[PDB]
Amino acid sequence: PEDELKRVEKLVKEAEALLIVAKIKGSKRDLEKALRTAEEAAREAVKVLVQALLEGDPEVALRAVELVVRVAELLLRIAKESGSREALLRALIVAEEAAKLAKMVLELAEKQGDPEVALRAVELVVRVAELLLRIAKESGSEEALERALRVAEEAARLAKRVLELAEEQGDPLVAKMAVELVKRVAELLERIARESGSEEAKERAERVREEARELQERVKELRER
Amino acid sequence: PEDELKRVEKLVKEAEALLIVAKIKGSKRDLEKALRTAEEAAREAVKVLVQALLEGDPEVALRAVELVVRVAELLLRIAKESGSREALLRALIVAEEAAKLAKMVLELAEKQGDPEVALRAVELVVRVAELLLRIAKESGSEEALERALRVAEEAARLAKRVLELAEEQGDPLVAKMAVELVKRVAELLERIARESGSEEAKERAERVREEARELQERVKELRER
Amino acid sequence: PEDELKRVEKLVKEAEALLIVAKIKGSKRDLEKALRTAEEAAREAVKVLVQALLEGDPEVALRAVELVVRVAELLLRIAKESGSREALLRALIVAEEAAKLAKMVLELAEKQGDPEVALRAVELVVRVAELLLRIAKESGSEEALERALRVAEEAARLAKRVLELAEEQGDPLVAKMAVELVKRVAELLERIARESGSEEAKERAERVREEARELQERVKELRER
Amino acid sequence: PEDELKRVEKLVKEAEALLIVAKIKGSKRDLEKALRTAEEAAREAVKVLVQALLEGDPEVALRAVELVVRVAELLLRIAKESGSREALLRALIVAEEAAKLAKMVLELAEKQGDPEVALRAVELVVRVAELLLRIAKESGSEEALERALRVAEEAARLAKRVLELAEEQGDPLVAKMAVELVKRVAELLERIARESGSEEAKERAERVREEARELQERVKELRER
Amino acid sequence: PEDELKRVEKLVKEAEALLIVAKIKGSKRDLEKALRTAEEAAREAVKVLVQALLEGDPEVALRAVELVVRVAELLLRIAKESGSREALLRALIVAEEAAKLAKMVLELAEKQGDPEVALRAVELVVRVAELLLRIAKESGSEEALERALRVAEEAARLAKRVLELAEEQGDPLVAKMAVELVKRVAELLERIARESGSEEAKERAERVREEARELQERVKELRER
Amino acid sequence: PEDELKRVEKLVKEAEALLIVAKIKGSKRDLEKALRTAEEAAREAVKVLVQALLEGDPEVALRAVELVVRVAELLLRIAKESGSREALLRALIVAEEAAKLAKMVLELAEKQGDPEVALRAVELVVRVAELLLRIAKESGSEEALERALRVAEEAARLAKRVLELAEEQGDPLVAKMAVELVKRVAELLERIARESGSEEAKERAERVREEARELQERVKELRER
Amino acid sequence: PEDELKRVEKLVKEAEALLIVAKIKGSKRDLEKALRTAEEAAREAVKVLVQALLEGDPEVALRAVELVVRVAELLLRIAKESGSREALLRALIVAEEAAKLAKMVLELAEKQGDPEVALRAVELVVRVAELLLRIAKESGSEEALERALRVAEEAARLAKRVLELAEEQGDPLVAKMAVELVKRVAELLERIARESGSEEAKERAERVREEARELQERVKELRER
Amino acid sequence: PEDELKRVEKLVKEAEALLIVAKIKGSKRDLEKALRTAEEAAREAVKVLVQALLEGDPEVALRAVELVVRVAELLLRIAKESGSREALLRALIVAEEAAKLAKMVLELAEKQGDPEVALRAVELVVRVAELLLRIAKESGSEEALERALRVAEEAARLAKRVLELAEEQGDPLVAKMAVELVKRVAELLERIARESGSEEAKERAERVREEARELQERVKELRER
Amino acid sequence: PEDELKRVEKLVKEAEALLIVAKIKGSKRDLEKALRTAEEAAREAVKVLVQALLEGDPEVALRAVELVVRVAELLLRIAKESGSREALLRALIVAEEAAKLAKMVLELAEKQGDPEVALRAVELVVRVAELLLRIAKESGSEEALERALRVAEEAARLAKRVLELAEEQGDPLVAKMAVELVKRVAELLERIARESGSEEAKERAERVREEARELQERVKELRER
């Protein structure tokens, strides 16, 4: 609930402080206390979401996954400072964690039938795929790009899955609000080909642009009553 | 209540700011924060109205739907800026939302018997049908005009329904104040034929001008005691 | 109370402004904001009076009904400008409203026994019957004259009712101050026969001039102790 | 107690509101909610008094019967509005109820020996006999005058009964304060002969004026020590 | 205490208002609300004093009896207006009440030993005996003069009783301040012989002038150490 | 404290006003309100001092006793006007009161060791002994002269007692400032022999002039280090 | 604890009040209530200390014995007023009581090893020996001087005992802070020879001045490491 | 915020005062109070910035770093006075501190995307590199020049980093406004070769003039749409 | 915390007052209340610091030790007045106390790694060694000089210990800011040889000037990367 998230926002908020004083003072006692403090917020947030996925409260769930992403952003701002690989390699866990959790909220909407609550989740997954870029381009790491393609296709499979609800409930507009989402995916996967030059990026990006074109005026077939 | 609406007016008021600074600076970080901030106000307003439709407080309800319309006006001023289709296609949801809600207040007046409170609602629905024009003529979109005809006839069916209360309570003047409303509807539907040239607009506009003439000095039959 | 009326005088005062700028500029955005702003003052004034009819504060009540009449005068100055029938037909509601409310203050004086406070009310009702003339002669409407006769006889029934208090409390002079009021009524109803030529006006005006003559030196019978 | 009466004053206070808005709006949904709301206060007040007649707290009892009379005044202001006979005929029940209850407080004072608390009760009974006049003269009903004579003699029997306490306790002045009460009764019963011309009114009024004269300087016989 | 007396001064202060408006307007609804409002202050004042006689707070007691006398003065200004005998005969109760209470404070000083607080009480009793004159000479009533002699001797018995404390505590001056009080009593009782010509007044006035002379330089016998 | 004394100076200041208007108008309603108003200030001043003797604030105490003396001067200006013995005999109480209180401040200085604050007190006691003369010579009373000798020796015992502090603290000059005080006492007691011719005045005045000579260059024995 | 001492300071503070009003008014009802109220504080203070000697809280103990001494000072200010021997002879009990208790705190410090807390106690015992002088010189009593010598040597035995802790803990300065204490004792015992001329005072004072000289640079032998 | 900076400007403003009076009077008590007072402002300013880097308020951050530089200027004006090395060596800490902090604001702009707010920061870093010259040329110290090269290249790395935002947001002019900044850097590093003759200055200055020439009409490639 | 220090600054601030009035008036009641009041502040300050050494709040600790030094300065200004040895010998305890406490804050910085917070502590210890001079030169005492050498070497051992942190964290400048501190120590110990002529002062001062020279450009070895 609300008061349980305020503890997590506090733990997060108590960690940028330990970071900036560590950027000022150069101390490493504090990063080691910021990192270990951010990991708490990434572990105290799942304790919230897991209570809220049992109840039918997804509006609280999304306000927890939105925190877990702010921890992965945070844990990236540490690795740039320290240059370590034990903090950077923690953010790819919290980032996979917040993608494997956004899917778990989408599942909660399919039974409840809440496309506006299912679509907010897929945006969070795209914040993650757009985050792992910033980890991969900054660090130059390769194990992130392997995941950003994983997480990105893990969303294009869901925009299709969100569209199966709009078409089911006769809400033609969230479909449009989801078809245009796949455009924001296909634009992303192309960015994984431009930087990190290869063929799987261009290929997988090309598989999705057809899965965009698969989501044609098919959607327009519904509002003709 | 009052303090709960001030939070929504705040959220709205905190979004034109993010828009004008985004029109000045050209930033897209802020539209993405304005859009996502306007959607909150469109979701925090229903949380108000839904509390107020349970109570017998329609005077507060209309002060919430009047906010939800100001969000649809807002979300149109973003699409003109960005040129996106995920913001424009959000305003047609908030606009349908504020029509499907104004009807829900009219229902609350039929049991309470408040024609002055039922007639203010139908004006809000006409602000919506007059809004979707500005979306359809500006954008050139077609899925709005399909709705503006839907929402407009969804009001002419209610002006008749408001007249069934005046005639029931012996208030001959709100009937007049509603008969002349259908004239403001029929003038609107004609505008959907002038622009967006077709026959359904002219036809449906012609069905209503007869339903205006159906609402003849029928109303005058009542105040003859 | 006082500070609550200053909000209503403000709302009224903020509406002549929107009118004159609309007469200068010819804009119709402003009438639609003046009308909708005057209606507030006609609805925020009843919220005052209704609080004051519960308390024994009629001196505040009359300072509210005097505002509601200034709104009906206002809403007539709009219809002359726009030529609409949805503003003119709103003033006949506020005008009936301020007559159905002045009676409600007179009732408060009968229990308190305040003929000077009961007689000020009947003057307000005569300002209304004298107002609906200006609506009927200007517009040429007929539904006002049907009401001006209604409101006018709705006062001659009360001047008699005020006289039943003076005669009860041994205040021979307010009776005189009320008997001469019926003369101001009978002069009015004659004016509804001169213009709007008919027999009900002349008839009903003639029924009251006898009800004036019924209120003979009957009043003089009291101060002979 | 105090907080239990504030609920009843609230229920009463929540009913004049429903009445004035019903006099403004002309609605009948609200009278049917005011009447049914006043009856609550007439039933929630006996729940107070009955708790207070068991305890020796008559000062609270009189503050409850004073409410039940304000409900009978209220339920008369509805019948003048609606013109119904199911509200008017409810006020004669609450009015008999508040007379059959004032006697029940007088009984509580005879054992406690509180003439100042016994005399306040008989005033409440005279407010009732003076109320049923306003029901009988306004409505023209006859079943009230049958009760006003019943309730009025039901007080003249008690002023005598109050005098039997003053004479018992050597408080010569409350006797005077009660002997002069019977004068206020005899003046009342005469009023039931003047209006509602008959002989029982004049007769019963004449039986009491002798029972006034029976209460001669008999009272003066006591303070001669 | 202080805030509890401010409620009583308020109730008193809210009653001269109802009186002057009743002298202006001639209304009798207001006297009947002033009288019934003054009686409250005479009953809410004993609720104060009785709380303060239990505690050792006579300085608050005298500030309550001083109010109860201001109510008896008030209830005399009503009888001159109305001419009633149920208000005049209420003031002789509040006046006896404030004499039977001043004695009850004097008793509280004998145990505490406070002659300056015992002597202020006897002055209040003399304000009462000097008040009942104004009731008896104005009205011409006889039942007051029977009490003014009762209350006056009820003080001369106490000035002697106050002197038994000064002589006990070796405070020779309050004795003088009390011996000269009996002179103010004997002057009073003579006034009850001058007006209301009789022998008991002259006799009882003569019994006290010897009880003044009994209180000779007896008092001077003490300060010779 | 300061704001609490301003209430007492106000009460005093509100009493000379009532006196001068009573000397102009000759009214006795006002003396009876001035006397009873001065007694308040003599009773509200002890409430100050008693709060200040508990704290170590003698500078405030002397600013209260200086008020109580101004009330005894005041209450003498009334007795000259009225010629009463109940006001004159009140001033000898306030005058004894302000002597029995100045001693109570001197006691507070002995523990604090403040000879300059102890000597100001003895001056106040001499203002009292010099005041009772003006009461005794004006009135011709004898019970004052019995007190002026009491109060005067009640100071010569204290000038000796003040000298025991100067000699204790090695402040040779306040001793001189106190030895010369006894000269102002011995001059006073002689004045009580010149007027009011007797032997106790001359005797007691002669006992003190030796107690002056006892306070020889004894004081000079100290400053020889 | 703290809130339990505030009750004792209250009881003390409620007793100077009863004293000053008794010095003003001369009443003996109040001394008999002040004395009996001070004895409470002397008995409610031991109830505190005894709870605090069981715990290891001497900082609270000294804040209780400091109260018991303020009661012995108080009970001396009564005997000067009344002149009684049952109040004076109560202060020598509270004064012995606060010496027999200060020793009981010193014992608590020897086990805890707190010389700064042991030395504050011996100061309290010297406040007692310096108090019994003021009882003996004022009253002229002899049974106090027998105790002041008892209590004074009961401290010089403890300053030696405090020095055995400083020497044990290697805190050379509290020893100095205690050696100079014995000088404040020896100066005291000499004062018991100057006044109350005898040989035991001079003798016992001379035994201690050698026990001062016994406490030579013996103390200086320690800080030579 | 604003009121928190006014405390820091006050602390600064309270330190030039202590300096000028120390230059007048020659006192060293005041430098030791000015230095220790300037260090507060350098420590109370980071407490501001650190609160403002958490919020998105860089406009306040730059108004704090601008203070910290005014303290380093101040702490240089002390070392010229005293000639000490503990004040001069404090200014190189506050100067490094205000460079390590300006970078921390630039980081805040990269996420917000505010090139005008990122470029103001790099100017502050150049005020620092231009300050350490005045420390190095005045004092002749070498440990400053080692830092001025550190801080100067720590800016040329950021002007490039600012240009990566302009090129990202399509703001071609702030790039120009940053390319010309590197010219102000390269001119500076040359000044570190002219004075303090060496090769690293000339070398590092030459590495940057090529990094200026690297920032060619590359910038002009963008505004060709 | 802050509000807990304001109580200690109050206790201190309430003691200079008692001193100046004691220098004016010459009273010894007040020194005995100032001394005993300063000792409170020296004992209420450790209660703060001890709470703050448990938390990681050294910024509050230094604001407490800075108070305890202001008490040792205060307790020296008393001994000059009284000439006592029980106040002077209390200041050497508070002065050792504030040195044994500054070390306890330095310990808190070694675990936190805060050289700027560790160096402020050693300055406080040098304020103490510079204070005991003013005690030793003024009084001429020898037991202070034994401590000033103890406290002074107790700092030169810590400046070395502070340098072990700078060298550990790569902060070359606080080392300089600490190396120059030992110069301020060696200058001090020489002052203990100039006055108080001996060889241990010159010797120990000479041991430290070599420990200054031990802290050579050793520090310069670090910033060569």
What does this structure look like?
The PDB classes it as protein fibril. Keywords: Protein design, filament, protein fibril. The assembly is nonameric. DHF119 filament. Chains A and 8 copies: DHF119 filament. The structure is a homononamer of 225-residue chains. Chain A is mostly helical. Chain A has one domain. Chain A is built from nine helices and no strands. The longest helix of chain A is centred in the first third of the chain and has 25 residues, at 58-82. Chain A starts with a helix and ends in an 11-residue tail after the last helix. Chain A binds chain B through residues 172-174, 176-177, 180-181, 223, and chain B through 84-86, 89-90, 92-93, 96, 143, 146.
Order of helices and strands of chain A: HHHHHHHHH
Count of helices of chain A?
9
Oligomer: homononamer
Q: What general outline of chain A do the C-alpha atoms trace? A: flat
First-to-last CA distance of chain A: 42 Å
- Structural class, from secondary structure content of chain A? mainly alpha
Residues in helices of chain A, as a percent range: over 70%
Strand content of chain A: under 5%
Task: Give me the count of strands of chain A.
Answer: 0
Please describe the biggest sheet of chain A, giving its number of strands, its sense, and whether it closes into a barrel.
none
Total individual domains of chain A: 1
Give the largest interface pair and sizes.
Answer: A-B, 8 and 10 residues
Radius of gyration of chain A: 19 Å
PDB class: protein fibril
Keywords: Protein design, filament, protein fibril
Assembly: nonameric
Entry title: DHF119 filament
